[PDB]
Amino acid sequence: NLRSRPLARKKLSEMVEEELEQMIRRREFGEGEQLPSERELMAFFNVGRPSVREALAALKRKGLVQINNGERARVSRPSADTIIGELSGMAKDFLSHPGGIAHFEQLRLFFESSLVRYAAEHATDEQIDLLAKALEINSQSLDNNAAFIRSDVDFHRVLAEIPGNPIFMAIHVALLDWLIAARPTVTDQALHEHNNVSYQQHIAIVDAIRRHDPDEADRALQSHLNSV
Amino acid sequence: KKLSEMVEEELEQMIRRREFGEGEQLPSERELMAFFNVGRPSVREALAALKRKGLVQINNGERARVSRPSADTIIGELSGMAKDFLSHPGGIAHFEQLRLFFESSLVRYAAEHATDEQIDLLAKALEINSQSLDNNAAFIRSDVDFHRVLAEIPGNPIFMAIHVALLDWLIAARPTVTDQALHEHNNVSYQQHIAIVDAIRRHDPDEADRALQSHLNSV
DNA sequence: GGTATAACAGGTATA
DNA sequence: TATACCTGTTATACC
C-alpha cells in the first residue's frame, strides 16, 4: 500500500478501495480506461489479485466504473439510471400487498398530465412534426399484435422526450418497465377496439394541443386511463 | 453472463418471500454452492453487495441475518447521488423542475374529493404555520409541515416517501441558506397559500396552479 | 475442530 | 493474438 500498513483484522480491502477513491477524486485520471489492468495495480500495491477484483466490483456497484469483457474499467459518474438500478428493491412489496397498484397508476397519471400540460403550454413550431410523424406511423392498421403496443409506447416516449430532461426519460422508462412487468395473462380479446379507441384519443389529444386547450386533452387522457 | 447477479437476485427474492425470519436461519453456503454449481468468489461478491445494500450483517465468521429498518440505505443513496453537481451547473434546476411536476399534481387534486374533512385539517395546520415566528427554525418547520399535510391529502404512502426524499435531497444539495431573504420568501409563500386555500374552497384549480407557478418563479 | 480469508495456477470465450 | 471470467487446489488465525 506504499505506506507499510497491514490492517489485516480491520479489512485491508477498505484501505485499498479508499485509496483508489482518493486517487480518482484527485483528478489524476481521465474518463476512460486510463487506469491500469488488474495485474499492474496488484504488482504496484503488493497485494492479492482477488482483492483488486473485489474492490473494482464494489466500486462498480457504488457507481464509479464500468466493465464489460476484455477491457479495463471506464470511470464515469452515477447517472439517473444508476439510482433506479440501485433502487427497485422494495418494488416487489408494493406488488405483493394488495394496495399500491392504484398508487402507481395515480403517479403515472399525474406525471403524464404534468408533461402533457407542459408540452401544450411550451408548444413550439418544431415539435409538431415529431408528434405528426408519430401519429402517422401509428395510424395504419398492418399488425394488430404487439406491434401496436410498441408503437404506442414509442409514441409515449417521444411525447415524454419533449421537455428534454435526462431524469425525465429515465423515470419514464422505469415506470413503463415496472408497469409492463405487472401485466399477467395478456390476452387478445378486445385489443383491436382498444387500439381504435387509443388512436381516436391520440387524435383528440393532438387536436387539443393544436387548439391550445389542455382541458379536452386531460379529459381524453383520463378516459383512456380509465378504459385501460 | 455473470453468475453473481443471478444468485444475488435469487437470495433477494427468497428473503423477500419471508422464508427465513430473524436470526441465522440460512443453511451452510457450501452446499448451496454445490447445489447451484457456482463459484466461491461469486458468493463472497453477493454477500458484499448485500452488506453494501444494508440487509445482512457480517463482522467476523458468523452467519448473515435480516434487516427490517431501511434508514441506512436511504442516507447511503443520498450520499451516493448528491455528487453530480459540478458537471451540470443549471441541470440541478431540472431536478427542481421535477419538484414542480410533483406539486402541480397536488393543488389540482383538492377540488376532486376533499369536501370538509381535509379543509379543517389544513386550516388548523396553517393556523400554527402562521403563528410561527422564527425565520430559520419555525418558518422552515411550518413550511415542511404544510407540504406534508398537502401531500397527505390523497392518502398515499408512496407520495409521502417521494416528498420526504425530495426534501432531504434538496437539503443536501443546497449548501448555502439565507435568513433575511428567506423571511420575505416564506412571507410571500404563505401570502400565496392564502390565495391557494381560497381557490380550493371556491373549487378553482386554475388559480391555485397559477399561484404555485408564481411562487416557484419567485424563488 | 469449524469459521472466513488468504494465496496460487489452469482452461476458455471473446474483441 | 491478447484479454478477463470461471474453476481447480491448499494454508492460517480466531472462537
Residue numbers in the entry:
A (entry chain C): 21 to 248
B (entry chain D): 30 to 248
Article passage:
The Escherichia coli GntR-type transcriptional repressor, NanR, regulates sialic acid metabolism, but the mechanism is unclear. Analogous to other GntR members, the NanR monomer has a two-domain architecture, comprising an N-terminal winged helix–turn–helix DNA-binding domain (α1–α3, β1–β2, green) linked to an α-helical C-terminal effector-binding domain (α4–α10, tan). Here, we demonstrate that three NanR dimers bind a (GGTATA)3-repeat operator cooperatively and with high affinity. The effector, N-acetylneuraminate, binds NanR and attenuates the NanR-DNA interaction.
We used the (GGTATA)2-repeat oligonucleotide to solve this structure as NanR bound poorly to the oligonucleotide with only one GGTATA repeat. NanR binds DNA in an asymmetric pose relative to the DNA helix. The C-terminal domain closely matched that found in the NanR crystal structure (RMSD = 2.1 Å), showing that DNA binding does not markedly alter C-terminal domain architecture. However, the direction, length, and position of the α4-linking helices are altered when compared to the crystal structure. In contrast, when bound to DNA in the cryo-EM structure, we observed that the α4-linking helices are oriented in a different direction and adopt a more extended conformation (green and black). The α2- and α3-helices of each N-terminal DNA-binding domain make contact at the major groove, whereas the α1-helices interact with the DNA phosphate backbone. Comparatively, monomer A is better resolved, particularly in the wing motif and the α3-helix, which allowed several of the putative DNA-binding sidechains, such as Arg73, to be assigned in the model. Despite the assignment of these putative DNA-binding residues based on these inferences, it is important to note that the resolution of the overall DNA-binding region (~5 Å) is insufficient to resolve specific DNA base pair contacts with the (GGTATA)2-repeat oligonucleotide. However, unlike FadR, where each N-terminal domain binds a palindromic DNA sequence symmetrically, NanR binds a repeat sequence with one N-terminal domain of the dimer engaging the consensus (GGTATA) sequence and the other N-terminal domain binding an adjacent non-consensus DNA sequence.
